[PDB]
Write an enzyme that holds these catalytic residues in place. Structure first.
Site, PDB file in Angstrom:
ATOM      1  CG  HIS A  26      -0.242  -0.047   2.517  1.00 50.60           C
ATOM      2  ND1 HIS A  26       0.189  -1.222   3.093  1.00 50.60           N
ATOM      3  CD2 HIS A  26       0.129   0.943   3.360  1.00 50.60           C
ATOM      4  CE1 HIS A  26       0.781  -0.956   4.243  1.00 50.60           C
ATOM      5  NE2 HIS A  26       0.759   0.351   4.428  1.00 50.60           N
TER       6      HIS A  26
ATOM      7  CG  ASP B 283       0.010  -5.544   2.731  1.00 51.87           C
ATOM      8  OD1 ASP B 283       0.194  -5.087   1.589  1.00 51.87           O
ATOM      9  OD2 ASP B 283      -0.595  -4.914   3.625  1.00 51.87           O
TER      10      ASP B 283
ATOM     11  CB  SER C 149       4.377   1.323   6.259  1.00 54.03           C
ATOM     12  OG  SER C 149       3.065   1.669   6.646  1.00 54.03           O
TER      13      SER C 149
END
Lengths: 163, 48, 163, 163
Positions: free
Chosen positions: A40, A62, A114
């Site tokens: 993302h 992910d 992140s």
């Protein structure tokens, strides 16, 4: 205090932020000779060596992940399967590990947080932060990690936010 | 054919001028940060 | 001296620049729950919340406007319509309001300082700077303002250059 | 020491960088009413006047040129064709002119320093740096220069890398 400064000394060499148009969206980790990048998060890795490498994708966990060049292989992080309960380190202070759940006292953890590698009491990476949820007065995290067999394990609490 | 074309052009042009005048009415009143519409120009221009 | 410091203290969090490949070409305004942003300034909003919206257009007034959500309406600028003639505060110092016209002394004024609101001695926005024209020694501004009735009046002198 | 300060004082206003998403990849040159700018350096001109023009191209001589207006022709560099062998001033120190060839000692030279003009002890541009090739300990330059007749000669050694 003291714990965060050696983590800054480690992250200055091997943790690389991504370059969105004006800000930082996420952090690429180089551990064991395999570059890791969350999905993302979108942008460009700061190194021109790490930018040109095409990444393979794993949508269940992910994370984009490519292989690091041969010169960079010695200058990588280290990874550990064994984690006992207690306290581990992180760029924003400390992180508690209890019943298999990396939790952080609240007020910290937002967008642009992140791919930060959770370190240990030696300097080895035990987890990679991908996001979390505010569990009352203390936030828990949604990390990927490793176990004794060599199997990448992702834990995610209820209704987490992709940071 | 020519009467239907004349009627079509006239109805389309009148509707175009109606939408132009409704935009010209409501453009100064929507840029204000108070965001209010007076009594006459609300119902007569379907402003709500 | 202290006027520029008061402008930087009032317009710190509420003013967001417009980026275009690293270049600052304009400034939006968050006032009354509305996001004012001009036509000729093209680029991406530096704020993440204000960029993911849809702005209704008005090409005759030269304004794009949107709806600020309720969790940010308290942290906006103030606005009023009661203005006398004389002096007002601007980001590069002072601005004169004479005969219903805003005038700025020369030396300042280039491409990029479009969208800066004009403040008063209390802290309320009275006009929004959109363009300027060089008049002898003292330049004039092409701005927008309000009135007692509630009609947004756009004042534009002859042969202005958009900033 | 003072040579770099003299280069920064002479090339302060007349040298404009080329921006490409915030990256400085080249430098144009304003000399003789002309704007020299290479092919491989792609981006936007930081100056507002020089960017809104049309540059005639020459792919063989690797040069784009344009017409500087009359209100800026006095604030240009100087140029000459009379050059002896020996030493000359460059932005990173000194450059040797031997056998009609420009040589730079190693340690300096990367991607981005393309278009920097070579100055002399008086203040005149004698060459324009376009590329470089690593030769043993002392690198050679691929540049352009002029002559007594008035023909722009492009000197290019073997297997050069464009900067």
């Amino acid at each position: 205090g003291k714990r965060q400064r050696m983590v800054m000394k480690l992250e200055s060499d091997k943790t690389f932020p991504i370059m969105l148009e004006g800000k930082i969206n996420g952090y690429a980790c180089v551990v064991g000779g395999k570059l890791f990048r969350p999905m993302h998060v979108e942008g460009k890795i700061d190194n021109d060596v790490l930018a040109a490498l095409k990444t393979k994708k794993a949508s269940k966990y992910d994370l984009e992940y490519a292989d690091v060049p041969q010169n960079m292989r010695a200058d990588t992080f280290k990874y550990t399967h064994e984690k006992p309960q207690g306290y581990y380190s992180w760029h924003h202070g400390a992180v508690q590990y209890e019943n298999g759940r990396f939790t952080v006292p609240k007020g910290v953890g937002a967008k642009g947080d992140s791919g930060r590698p959770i370190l240990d009491n030696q300097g080895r990476v035990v987890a990679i932060v991908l996001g979390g949820v505010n569990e009352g007065s203390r936030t828990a995290l949604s990390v990927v990690m490793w176990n004794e067999k060599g199997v990448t394990v992702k834990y995610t609490p209820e209704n987490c936010e992709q940071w | 054919s020519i009467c239907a074309a004349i009627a079509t052009v006239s109805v389309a042009a009148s509707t175009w001028l109606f939408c132009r005048s409704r935009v010209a009415c409501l453009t100064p009143y929507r840029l204000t940060p108070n965001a209010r519409i007076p009594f006459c120009l609300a119902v007569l221009c379907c402003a709500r």
